[PDB]
Amino acid sequence: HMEAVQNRIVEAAERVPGVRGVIHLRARYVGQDIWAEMIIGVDPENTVEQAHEICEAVQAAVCGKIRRIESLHVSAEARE
Amino acid sequence: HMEAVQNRIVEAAERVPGVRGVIHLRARYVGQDIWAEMIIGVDPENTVEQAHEICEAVQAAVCGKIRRIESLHVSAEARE
């Protein structure tokens, strides 16, 4: 039942400035730990550097809030 | 291991305007559900009515964020 933990990931990520939705989220248990990969939407007119900053902020916010996550890979794609 | 869920309760409650710490928190599992009681600190010069409003806001915020909670009793005491 991954719904609860994935809902928490999505909520945490959406609250980070510059996130235009969670496009993709894959999470899996590795023992009691979560390993996850996610794609966030960002403003197509943000720079590549800004998108990298948003990704890093999402990684921090999500790992900060969901303590069981032991790996979180975040990438960005243009949305709207 | 109640630490993770109790940390989440405390954090959620502290982010509600007017909460001056969590004085007490007791949480227990009733099957897969959490039942909890908590005491929040509030400004001694808030009115009784305001303290009741803060308690209700904490109940909403905490239940909103921690979906496994199926009962949450919140009371208030003067702090500082």
PDB file of C-alpha atoms in Angstrom:
ATOM      1  CA  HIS A   1       0.000   0.000   0.000  1.00  0.00           C
ATOM      2  CA  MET A   2       2.099   2.837  -1.320  1.00  0.00           C
ATOM      3  CA  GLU A   3      -0.633   5.426  -1.556  1.00  0.00           C
ATOM      4  CA  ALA A   4      -0.029   7.172   1.796  1.00  0.00           C
ATOM      5  CA  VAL A   5       3.701   7.579   1.438  1.00  0.00           C
ATOM      6  CA  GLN A   6       3.418   8.614  -2.217  1.00  0.00           C
ATOM      7  CA  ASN A   7       0.756  11.198  -1.318  1.00  0.00           C
ATOM      8  CA  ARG A   8       3.165  12.634   1.233  1.00  0.00           C
ATOM      9  CA  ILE A   9       5.974  12.807  -1.323  1.00  0.00           C
ATOM     10  CA  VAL A  10       3.807  14.597  -3.844  1.00  0.00           C
ATOM     11  CA  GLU A  11       2.482  17.101  -1.298  1.00  0.00           C
ATOM     12  CA  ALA A  12       5.950  17.896  -0.022  1.00  0.00           C
ATOM     13  CA  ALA A  13       7.287  18.416  -3.511  1.00  0.00           C
ATOM     14  CA  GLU A  14       4.386  20.616  -4.647  1.00  0.00           C
ATOM     15  CA  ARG A  15       4.963  23.017  -1.754  1.00  0.00           C
ATOM     16  CA  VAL A  16       8.479  23.857  -3.023  1.00  0.00           C
ATOM     17  CA  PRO A  17       8.658  27.127  -4.919  1.00  0.00           C
ATOM     18  CA  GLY A  18       8.857  26.552  -8.704  1.00  0.00           C
ATOM     19  CA  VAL A  19       7.300  23.092  -8.782  1.00  0.00           C
ATOM     20  CA  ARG A  20       4.520  22.880 -11.439  1.00  0.00           C
ATOM     21  CA  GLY A  21       3.252  19.450 -10.445  1.00  0.00           C
ATOM     22  CA  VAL A  22       4.752  16.059 -10.053  1.00  0.00           C
ATOM     23  CA  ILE A  23       4.919  14.475 -13.453  1.00  0.00           C
ATOM     24  CA  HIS A  24       6.232  11.095 -12.352  1.00  0.00           C
ATOM     25  CA  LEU A  25       6.933   9.296  -9.088  1.00  0.00           C
ATOM     26  CA  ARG A  26       8.245   5.828  -8.633  1.00  0.00           C
ATOM     27  CA  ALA A  27       8.810   4.583  -5.112  1.00  0.00           C
ATOM     28  CA  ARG A  28       9.829   1.272  -3.899  1.00  0.00           C
ATOM     29  CA  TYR A  29      10.712  -0.285  -0.588  1.00  0.00           C
ATOM     30  CA  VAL A  30      14.313  -1.509  -0.190  1.00  0.00           C
ATOM     31  CA  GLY A  31      13.845  -3.223   3.158  1.00  0.00           C
ATOM     32  CA  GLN A  32      12.162  -0.664   5.420  1.00  0.00           C
ATOM     33  CA  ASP A  33      13.620   2.210   3.347  1.00  0.00           C
ATOM     34  CA  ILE A  34      12.098   4.031   0.408  1.00  0.00           C
ATOM     35  CA  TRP A  35      14.039   4.643  -2.792  1.00  0.00           C
ATOM     36  CA  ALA A  36      12.309   6.964  -5.210  1.00  0.00           C
ATOM     37  CA  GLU A  37      12.681   8.780  -8.510  1.00  0.00           C
ATOM     38  CA  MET A  38      10.631  11.698  -9.528  1.00  0.00           C
ATOM     39  CA  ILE A  39      10.108  14.200 -12.294  1.00  0.00           C
ATOM     40  CA  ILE A  40       8.809  17.641 -11.478  1.00  0.00           C
ATOM     41  CA  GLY A  41       7.324  20.172 -13.912  1.00  0.00           C
ATOM     42  CA  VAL A  42       8.948  23.603 -14.042  1.00  0.00           C
ATOM     43  CA  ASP A  43       8.427  26.882 -15.937  1.00  0.00           C
ATOM     44  CA  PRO A  44       9.867  26.263 -19.463  1.00  0.00           C
ATOM     45  CA  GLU A  45      11.497  29.736 -19.183  1.00  0.00           C
ATOM     46  CA  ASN A  46      13.398  28.935 -16.008  1.00  0.00           C
ATOM     47  CA  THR A  47      17.049  28.402 -16.798  1.00  0.00           C
ATOM     48  CA  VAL A  48      18.651  24.979 -16.622  1.00  0.00           C
ATOM     49  CA  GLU A  49      20.491  26.205 -13.522  1.00  0.00           C
ATOM     50  CA  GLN A  50      17.234  27.293 -11.859  1.00  0.00           C
ATOM     51  CA  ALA A  51      15.651  23.910 -12.669  1.00  0.00           C
ATOM     52  CA  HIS A  52      18.628  22.213 -11.004  1.00  0.00           C
ATOM     53  CA  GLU A  53      18.082  24.434  -7.924  1.00  0.00           C
ATOM     54  CA  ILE A  54      14.405  23.534  -7.767  1.00  0.00           C
ATOM     55  CA  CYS A  55      15.290  19.836  -8.038  1.00  0.00           C
ATOM     56  CA  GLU A  56      17.757  20.170  -5.161  1.00  0.00           C
ATOM     57  CA  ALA A  57      15.186  22.026  -3.048  1.00  0.00           C
ATOM     58  CA  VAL A  58      12.591  19.313  -3.721  1.00  0.00           C
ATOM     59  CA  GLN A  59      15.108  16.625  -2.692  1.00  0.00           C
ATOM     60  CA  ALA A  60      15.774  18.472   0.555  1.00  0.00           C
ATOM     61  CA  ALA A  61      12.104  19.177   1.341  1.00  0.00           C
ATOM     62  CA  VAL A  62      10.891  15.657   0.567  1.00  0.00           C
ATOM     63  CA  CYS A  63      13.759  13.914   2.429  1.00  0.00           C
ATOM     64  CA  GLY A  64      13.258  16.295   5.323  1.00  0.00           C
ATOM     65  CA  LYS A  65       9.586  15.429   5.658  1.00  0.00           C
ATOM     66  CA  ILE A  66       9.600  11.699   4.883  1.00  0.00           C
ATOM     67  CA  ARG A  67      12.269  10.181   7.042  1.00  0.00           C
ATOM     68  CA  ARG A  68      12.122   6.647   5.579  1.00  0.00           C
ATOM     69  CA  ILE A  69      13.385   7.897   2.192  1.00  0.00           C
ATOM     70  CA  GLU A  70      17.048   6.912   1.752  1.00  0.00           C
ATOM     71  CA  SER A  71      17.372   7.732  -1.939  1.00  0.00           C
ATOM     72  CA  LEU A  72      15.528  10.355  -3.970  1.00  0.00           C
ATOM     73  CA  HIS A  73      16.485  11.233  -7.568  1.00  0.00           C
ATOM     74  CA  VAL A  74      14.736  14.349  -8.880  1.00  0.00           C
ATOM     75  CA  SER A  75      14.686  15.621 -12.479  1.00  0.00           C
ATOM     76  CA  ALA A  76      12.733  18.369 -14.181  1.00  0.00           C
ATOM     77  CA  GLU A  77      10.749  18.845 -17.386  1.00  0.00           C
ATOM     78  CA  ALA A  78       9.066  21.929 -18.898  1.00  0.00           C
ATOM     79  CA  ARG A  79       5.374  22.228 -18.028  1.00  0.00           C
ATOM     80  CA  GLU A  80       3.049  25.005 -19.332  1.00  0.00           C
TER      81      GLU A  80
ATOM     82  CA  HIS B   1       8.220   2.462  17.271  1.00  0.00           C
ATOM     83  CA  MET B   2       6.069   5.513  17.777  1.00  0.00           C
ATOM     84  CA  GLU B   3       8.754   8.116  17.295  1.00  0.00           C
ATOM     85  CA  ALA B   4       8.128   8.876  13.596  1.00  0.00           C
ATOM     86  CA  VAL B   5       4.390   9.299  13.840  1.00  0.00           C
ATOM     87  CA  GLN B   6       4.646  11.293  17.076  1.00  0.00           C
ATOM     88  CA  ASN B   7       7.264  13.582  15.503  1.00  0.00           C
ATOM     89  CA  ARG B   8       4.836  14.229  12.664  1.00  0.00           C
ATOM     90  CA  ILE B   9       2.019  15.040  15.084  1.00  0.00           C
ATOM     91  CA  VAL B  10       4.147  17.484  17.019  1.00  0.00           C
ATOM     92  CA  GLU B  11       5.434  19.227  13.887  1.00  0.00           C
ATOM     93  CA  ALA B  12       1.956  19.585  12.451  1.00  0.00           C
ATOM     94  CA  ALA B  13       0.602  21.008  15.671  1.00  0.00           C
ATOM     95  CA  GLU B  14       3.460  23.484  16.160  1.00  0.00           C
ATOM     96  CA  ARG B  15       2.848  25.000  12.726  1.00  0.00           C
ATOM     97  CA  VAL B  16      -0.685  26.091  13.728  1.00  0.00           C
ATOM     98  CA  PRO B  17      -0.926  29.749  14.667  1.00  0.00           C
ATOM     99  CA  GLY B  18      -1.125  30.219  18.466  1.00  0.00           C
ATOM    100  CA  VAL B  19       0.493  26.938  19.475  1.00  0.00           C
ATOM    101  CA  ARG B  20       3.270  27.504  22.084  1.00  0.00           C
ATOM    102  CA  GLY B  21       4.601  23.956  22.055  1.00  0.00           C
ATOM    103  CA  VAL B  22       3.161  20.560  22.601  1.00  0.00           C
ATOM    104  CA  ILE B  23       3.014  19.955  26.303  1.00  0.00           C
ATOM    105  CA  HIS B  24       1.764  16.380  26.164  1.00  0.00           C
ATOM    106  CA  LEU B  25       1.102  13.751  23.513  1.00  0.00           C
ATOM    107  CA  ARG B  26      -0.147  10.267  24.019  1.00  0.00           C
ATOM    108  CA  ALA B  27      -0.681   8.103  20.969  1.00  0.00           C
ATOM    109  CA  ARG B  28      -1.639   4.570  20.702  1.00  0.00           C
ATOM    110  CA  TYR B  29      -2.486   2.158  17.940  1.00  0.00           C
ATOM    111  CA  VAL B  30      -6.065   0.809  17.898  1.00  0.00           C
ATOM    112  CA  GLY B  31      -5.558  -1.741  15.139  1.00  0.00           C
ATOM    113  CA  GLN B  32      -3.915   0.138  12.263  1.00  0.00           C
ATOM    114  CA  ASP B  33      -5.428   3.441  13.483  1.00  0.00           C
ATOM    115  CA  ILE B  34      -3.945   6.017  15.814  1.00  0.00           C
ATOM    116  CA  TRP B  35      -5.905   7.440  18.733  1.00  0.00           C
ATOM    117  CA  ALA B  36      -4.223  10.360  20.426  1.00  0.00           C
ATOM    118  CA  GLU B  37      -4.634  12.997  23.110  1.00  0.00           C
ATOM    119  CA  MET B  38      -2.638  16.117  23.293  1.00  0.00           C
ATOM    120  CA  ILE B  39      -2.166  19.284  25.276  1.00  0.00           C
ATOM    121  CA  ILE B  40      -0.926  22.397  23.553  1.00  0.00           C
ATOM    122  CA  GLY B  41       0.509  25.519  25.206  1.00  0.00           C
ATOM    123  CA  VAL B  42      -1.177  28.828  24.404  1.00  0.00           C
ATOM    124  CA  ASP B  43      -0.717  32.506  25.337  1.00  0.00           C
ATOM    125  CA  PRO B  44      -2.155  32.842  28.902  1.00  0.00           C
ATOM    126  CA  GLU B  45      -3.845  36.080  27.694  1.00  0.00           C
ATOM    127  CA  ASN B  46      -5.725  34.414  24.861  1.00  0.00           C
ATOM    128  CA  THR B  47      -9.367  34.051  25.774  1.00  0.00           C
ATOM    129  CA  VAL B  48     -10.908  30.681  26.537  1.00  0.00           C
ATOM    130  CA  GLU B  49     -12.762  30.988  23.225  1.00  0.00           C
ATOM    131  CA  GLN B  50      -9.521  31.641  21.322  1.00  0.00           C
ATOM    132  CA  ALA B  51      -7.881  28.633  23.016  1.00  0.00           C
ATOM    133  CA  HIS B  52     -10.823  26.495  21.881  1.00  0.00           C
ATOM    134  CA  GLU B  53     -10.309  27.806  18.312  1.00  0.00           C
ATOM    135  CA  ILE B  54      -6.616  26.963  18.396  1.00  0.00           C
ATOM    136  CA  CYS B  55      -7.436  23.462  19.662  1.00  0.00           C
ATOM    137  CA  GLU B  56      -9.902  22.959  16.809  1.00  0.00           C
ATOM    138  CA  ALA B  57      -7.359  24.217  14.265  1.00  0.00           C
ATOM    139  CA  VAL B  58      -4.718  21.835  15.643  1.00  0.00           C
ATOM    140  CA  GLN B  59      -7.184  18.925  15.388  1.00  0.00           C
ATOM    141  CA  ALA B  60      -7.875  19.809  11.763  1.00  0.00           C
ATOM    142  CA  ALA B  61      -4.216  20.339  10.807  1.00  0.00           C
ATOM    143  CA  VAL B  62      -2.944  17.183  12.503  1.00  0.00           C
ATOM    144  CA  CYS B  63      -5.776  14.950  11.191  1.00  0.00           C
ATOM    145  CA  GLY B  64      -5.309  16.465   7.759  1.00  0.00           C
ATOM    146  CA  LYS B  65      -1.622  15.606   7.663  1.00  0.00           C
ATOM    147  CA  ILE B  66      -1.572  12.226   9.420  1.00  0.00           C
ATOM    148  CA  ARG B  67      -4.209  10.132   7.761  1.00  0.00           C
ATOM    149  CA  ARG B  68      -4.003   7.131  10.128  1.00  0.00           C
ATOM    150  CA  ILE B  69      -5.296   9.231  13.051  1.00  0.00           C
ATOM    151  CA  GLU B  70      -8.942   8.338  13.751  1.00  0.00           C
ATOM    152  CA  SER B  71      -9.290  10.123  17.081  1.00  0.00           C
ATOM    153  CA  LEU B  72      -7.497  13.231  18.321  1.00  0.00           C
ATOM    154  CA  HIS B  73      -8.478  15.035  21.547  1.00  0.00           C
ATOM    155  CA  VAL B  74      -6.787  18.420  21.960  1.00  0.00           C
ATOM    156  CA  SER B  75      -6.769  20.622  25.079  1.00  0.00           C
ATOM    157  CA  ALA B  76      -4.869  23.762  25.967  1.00  0.00           C
ATOM    158  CA  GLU B  77      -2.902  25.124  28.918  1.00  0.00           C
ATOM    159  CA  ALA B  78      -1.277  28.532  29.532  1.00  0.00           C
ATOM    160  CA  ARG B  79       2.412  28.649  28.605  1.00  0.00           C
ATOM    161  CA  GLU B  80       4.684  31.716  29.101  1.00  0.00           C
TER     162      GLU B  80
END
